[PDB]
Amino acid sequence: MDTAHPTASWEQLGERFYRKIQLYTQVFDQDFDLDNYIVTGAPYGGAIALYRDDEKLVAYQPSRSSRPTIDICSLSGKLLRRISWDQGPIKGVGWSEDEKLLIVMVDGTVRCYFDLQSEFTQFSLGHGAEEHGVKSCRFYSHGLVALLGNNALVSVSSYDEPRPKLLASPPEGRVYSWNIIPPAYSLSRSVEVLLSVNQTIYVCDASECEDRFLDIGPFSHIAVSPNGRFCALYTTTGKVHVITSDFQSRLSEHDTKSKIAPNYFEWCGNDAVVIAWDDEVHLVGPSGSLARFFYDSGRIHLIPDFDGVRILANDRCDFLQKVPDVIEEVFGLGADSPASILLDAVEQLEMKSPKADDNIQLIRPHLVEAVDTCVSAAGQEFSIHWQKQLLKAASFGKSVLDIYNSDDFVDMCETLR
Amino acid sequence: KDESALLEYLESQGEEPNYDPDFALRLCIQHRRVLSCAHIYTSM
């Protein structure tokens, strides 16, 4: 396993740590066409669905028909199942908390596939989906939400309960873009929608809508941070800004050199966002500083996972994630936390250095904090050596601490196993 | 079934009611390991 500890790719942008994890590589990369489909996220750590674009499968995979197919694959790139639809074009694909495949048709028809036998439950969107069509949708464990051709939104309390109700009345202005916020990150702990209308930002709640104006040109794609405190909005001018949940002034701004088309725009954490921008990936930090990643594909598609974004490629999967606080303190680039000292002890242990033991006693006063950090950190890793190194870091402190729960360590061990 | 709620009751009363650490642990551990161990070990 050469993907067990890919720490060399880590970088600091805007005084924050970011990591690109190459968990898997392919042997069929030259037989893998990723330029003709859109890949969705796997926010519960389930399979990643590859949704084929009927308008792209013309020159390379010339089906040339309105008969959409989705290839559902593991994170290794291995296909688990293939499902084809006879109901016309698919609006998009997401996942449930039980790793169900949630497919929304452009006419509001929804199917929730739960196994390799292609069995599914029934679901639907509001009537506007049939009268005007669906423009876009998002998938949540608390019910699905979608914006319809009349610029109105509908929602349910559960993705398996086909009883759609109006979420928000349609705007009277010109709609440029929108983003849907789940109860997890909303202020009312319910469904909220951000609408960019006539260069004004409207926030639609369950009972009321707020009207707030920000002085910027016509809007583009929108993405909301996983904390409910602020949102990054792109514009057609290339100027990017971040707006708070409570808007008195702008939080941050990022200048451009040229106009871009920031497709598949999503947050990789609470500090930074990832932009597909056709064939080049842009990572924008909290300071406005920009990092770039390069691929030889015709188009790069981003994977809107939970608290991170994966970058699609035929030779490897590049998981680009904002480093979690429990991770920054253990595998961080020069982090001064005692948790990073525990990980140093592990590296010293591998090398049979005496520093492995000294590193533990020197942080005794904060050792319990360092260990708890390593425990939470351990479950957030996707690689075998990284998980073992974080677990060993916790083990070191466990052997010294008189105030530590050794069963929590074991529970973590079983969790990592 | 709800072992946790029942342990919470004893935990609320305090450490003294259990008196013998090993006794309470043997009975809790044999029933369920790891998941219930962390609780009974934290309690007293």
Whether the Cβ atoms of residue A14 and residue A286 lie closer than 8 Å to each other: yes
Distance in angstroms (rounded) separating the CA atoms of residues A101 and A5: 31
The encoded tokens of residue A73 equal 């694959």
Whether the Cβ atoms of residue A292 and residue A304 lie closer than 8 Å to each other: no
Vertex A320 angle, CA A42 and A296, to 5° = 100
The encoded tokens of residue A336 equal 């001064």
> Mutate which of A375, A407, A412 to test chain B, going by most B C-beta atoms within 10 A?
A407
Residue in chain A closest to B33 (alpha carbons) equals A407
> Mutate which of B33, B35, B37, B40 to test chain A, going by most A C-beta atoms within 10 A?
B37
What count of Cα atoms within 13 Å lies in the side-chain half-sphere of residue A66? 7
- Residue entry with tokens 């013309």: A58
Distance from CA of A412 to the nearest CA of B (A): 10
Residues 368-407 (A) with a CB less than 8 A from some CB of B: 405-407
Tell me how crowded residue A157 is: count the other CB atoms within 10 A of its CB: 11
Per DSSP, A49 falls in state: E
In chain A, residues with a C-beta closer than 8 Å to the C-beta of B29 are none
Distance in angstroms (rounded) separating the CA atoms of residues A253 and A175: 22
What Å resolution does this PDB entry report? 5.1
Query: In DSSP terms, which residues pair with A37 in a beta bridge?
Result: A52
Amino acid A141 reads S
Q: What is the 3-state secondary structure (H, E, C) of A13-45?
A: CCCCEEEEEEEEECCCHHHCCCCCEEECCCCCC
What is the DSSP secondary-structure string of A315-364?
A: SEEEEEEEPPHHHHHHH-SS--SHHHHHHHHHHHHHTT-THHHHHHHTTG
Q: Which residues contact A204 (CB under 8 A, 6 or more apart)?
A: A153, A167, A168, A169, A192, A193, A194, A195
Say if the Cβ atoms of B37 and A414 lie within 8 Å.
Answer: no
Query: In DSSP terms, which residues pair with A177 in a beta bridge?
Result: A196
Query: In DSSP terms, which residues pair with A281 in a beta bridge?
Result: A293
- Residue entry with tokens 């260069």: A199
- How was this model experimentally determined? cryo-EM
